[PDB]
Each structure stands twice: as structure tokens, then as C-alpha cells.
């Protein structure tokens, strides 16, 4: 519910992603996403894990970090948009959760584009359209998200 030992299950689920080669795990992603929906009161530790996982983890795990962030991120704005959780204390709601990501989503995406392969870049890209459909305010779509620097650091062809 709060700073309980409940966190351990959320940690072990995140760690279960780190154990995979693809870093994605749809049912497990939905497990900690559903417990986060059942209790926004721990959004603070939850948001801390996605930014820390997404920044440290490998390229495939970065793709999986954005799947988690997409699931918990949209469902947080949607749930609070559907409920009185949009009118409560700052931490422990989508208010502080989308606020925290709104300042660092540039780190997660820009690194993930530079780290992940073209197919992974596309999975993130459909996630951005899905976020524009949900209306998440983390639209820090600066040129860092285009990551054109790391694109010039690598070979490419389209002609």
C-alpha cells in the first residue's frame, strides 16, 4: 500500500524483466501495472523503478521499459481521468507521476532510440502515437528524441 514490504514483488517483477533477453514480458508487465493501478499511493517508487530500469538496462530492456511505462503511464492518466484520483495529494497520483516523467522522459526515449535497433525504434514510435491518443503530457518530443546524432554515427541507406 505504501513503503511496505509489498515493494519486493514489484522489484522482483522488474528484475524478472532484467533476466530476459528481450526484456519484455507482457503478463508480468501487466502484474505490476495492475498493482500500480490498484494503488497509486506507491507511484513514487514505481516511477523511480521505470526511469532507473529504462536508463541502466540494455537496449532490449529499454524497449521493455517503454512497454511498462506505456501500460502504467497511460493507465494512470486514464484511471485518474476516470476517477477522483485526479483530485488528491500530489505524490500518490498521476499528477506527480506524469510530472516526474515529464522532466526525464527525454532521457529514457533519447537513450532508447540511440541504444535500440530500427525495429525497436519503431515499437517506441507506435508507443508515441499511442501516447498522443491517450494525451499523456510527457510529449517532450525534442530533437533529442529524434536521436539523429547516433543515426549519423552508424551506417544507413534508403536509396
Amino acid at each position: 500500500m505504501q513503503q511496505d514490504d509489498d515493494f519486493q514483488n514489484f522489484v522482483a517483477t522488474l528484475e524478472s524483466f532484467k533476466d530476459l533477453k528481450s526484456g519484455i514480458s507482457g503478463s508480468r508487465i501487466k502484474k505490476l501495472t495492475t498493482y500500480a493501478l490498484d494503488h497509486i499511493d506507491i507511484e513514487s517508487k514505481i516511477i523511480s523503478l521505470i526511469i532507473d530500469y529504462s536508463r541502466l538496462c540494455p537496449d532490449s530492456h529499454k524497449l521493455g521499459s517503454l512497454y511498462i511505462i506505456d501500460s502504467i503511464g497511460r493507465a494512470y492518466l486514464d484511471e485518474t481521468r476516470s476517477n477522483s484520483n485526479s483530485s488528491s495529494n500530489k505524490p500518490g497520483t498521476c499528477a506527480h507521476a506524469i510530472n516526474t516523467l515529464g522532466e526525464v522522459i527525454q532521457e529514457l526515449l533519447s537513450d532508447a532510440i540511440a541504444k535500440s535497433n530500427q525495429d525497436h525504434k519503431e515499437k517506441i514510435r507506435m508507443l508515441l502515437d499511442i501516447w498522443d491518443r491517450s494525451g499523456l503530457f510527457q510529449k517532450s518530443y525534442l530533437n533529442a528524441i529524434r536521436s539523429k546524432c547516433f543515426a549519423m554515427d552508424l551506417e544507413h541507406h534508403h536509396h
Partner: peptide, 12 residues
Amino acid sequence: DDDEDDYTPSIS
């Protein structure tokens, strides 16, 4: 590897 690997969100 395990689980619903390569999960896919969607919207119309």
C-alpha cells in the same frame, strides 16, 4: 523470452 514476449498495446 518467457511470458507474453513482445507485448503490443493498441488504439484506434
